[PDB]
Design a protein around this motif. Structure first.
Motif: not given
Lengths: 137, 137
Positions: A17-26, A127-133
């Protein structure tokens, strides 16, 4: 991708399971990330593998079995970087999940319930999410 | 509304912040709600009033002053209902914030920093938002 993110899935040895993303806060504001491998399509179903990042602080992993949380495992390993995207890869090994962050093995969690019991993966919190596989080999 | 939600604002005695929304998960999964009254437009700025609901468990309130969290106040009062929308109203009184949930006074928090120091309100974690309003009387 929308968060909370839900995808039906099946897992066995060799699944990733591959997840790619960014936290929504510092990190100063302590965002969270949660990844739950569920036994049914319903959010209230049991959780074979619970993976919860308190960004900048710690990681906890656990399982929820017949409605009850079990033995928590904690790790102060924190490879996630403040304000950066991350690539999170969760591999199903015969004996355990292996969790890689940005290419670096960072956590493991021995199977308490057969991974074939998983029917759904949920990715949520800050988080925000750009890929899920989900991929099988 | 987008979450995290940010709105510039100014507050004084008689100001009311009204928030209306819904948790993104059932209480069994322990969603959170966070409302932070910030001293600057930047998320890393000081926090005059921090209001954090662990739905179904507790509420904590605090302030972050020169980068450091201060004395936490905890309340096990839990007027929020599992799976329901909520109406959250935060009133600025001369001596304190008053927090009403669904019309019921539920929490208060004495001013540690003058409310006139607030420049920004942020609403985030595991909710969806349908209204945000700041009003003065």
């Amino acid at each position: 991708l929308p968060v909370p993110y839900t995808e039906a899935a099946s897992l066995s040895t060799g699944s990733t399971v591959t997840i790619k993303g960014r936290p929504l806060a510092a990190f100063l504001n302590e965002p969270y990330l949660q990844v739950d491998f569920h036994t049914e399509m319903k959010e209230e179903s049991d959780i074979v593998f619970h993976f919860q990042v308190a960004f900048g602080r710690r990681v906890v992993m656990n399982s929820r079995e017949y409605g009850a949380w079990k033995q928590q495992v904690e790790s102060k390993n924190m490879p996630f970087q403040d304000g950066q995207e991350f690539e999170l890869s969760i591999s199903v090994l015969p004996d355990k999940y292996q969790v890689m962050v940005n290419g670096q093995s960072s956590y493991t969690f021995d199977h308490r319930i057969k991974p074939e019991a998983v029917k759904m993966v949920q990715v949520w919190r800050d988080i925000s999410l750009t890929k899920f596989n989900v991929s099988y080999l």
